[PDB]
Design a protein around this ligand. Structure first.
Ligand SMILES: [Zn+2]
Ligand SMILES: [Zn+2]
Lengths: 147, 52
């Protein structure tokens, strides 16, 4: 009926994944997408293996999916606890939007993050104050968390 | 043909069934859902559907 979208997009972004965002395996639940993202070449973010557990509700293609990063990555817009909020997913959104667009939004946020702080401002404040201050730790953290 | 609303197939007579003239066609078993939990908006416009 409508659940097929979860598996369809899962396999879709598994065989031929878009830019940086890749899918494949699932989490503890079918509505718990365990996607993996890769860092860009311009910003201090490497590929490695960063998991992002996206939780879809009973209205996945109608209600904004709750994205919760599994792998703690040092990103000004990605809190250490996994708090990652998408700009286009803020204040509702247009009913049915492919996960590809949602994931691509994170990719665009990887190339030079946003100074707008989310849950914990620390990561955004350091970026807003000085780039190098966050650049040095970003590339270090992404490496130490690259298993 | 599969509606991007649920990644599920469509009907022959559903191909001409579009609640919006923005080229966005979707099977009846998809549009009805938008009018159930959502405000009945266009998945690529955020605007309310002219459909009943
Ligand atoms: Zn459908
Ligand atoms: Zn429209």
């Amino acid at each position: 009926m409508a659940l097929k979208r979860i598996h369809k997009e899962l396999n879709d972004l598994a065989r031929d994944p878009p830019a940086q965002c890749s899918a494949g395996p699932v989490g503890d639940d079918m509505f718990h997408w365990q996607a993996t993202i890769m860092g860009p070449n311009d910003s201090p973010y490497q590929g490695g293996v960063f998991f992002l557990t996206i939780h879809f509700p009973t209205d996945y293609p109608f209600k904004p999916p709750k994205v919760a990063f599994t792998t703690r990555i040092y990103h000004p817009n990605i809190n250490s606890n996994g708090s990652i909020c998408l700009d286009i997913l803020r204040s509702q959104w247009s009913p049915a939007l492919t996960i590809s667009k949602v994931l691509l939004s994170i990719c665009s946020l990887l190339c030079d993050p946003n100074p707008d702080d989310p849950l914990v401002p620390e990561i955004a404040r350091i970026y807003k104050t000085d780039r190098e201050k966050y650049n040095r730790i970003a590339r270090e953290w992404t490496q130490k968390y690259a298993m | 043909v599969e509606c991007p609303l649920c990644m599920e197939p469509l009907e022959i007579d559903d191909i001409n069934f579009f609640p919006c003239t923005c080229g966005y066609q979707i099977c009846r078993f998809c549009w009805h859902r938008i009018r159930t939990d959502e405000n009945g908006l266009c998945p690529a416009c955020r605007k309310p559907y002219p459909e009943d």
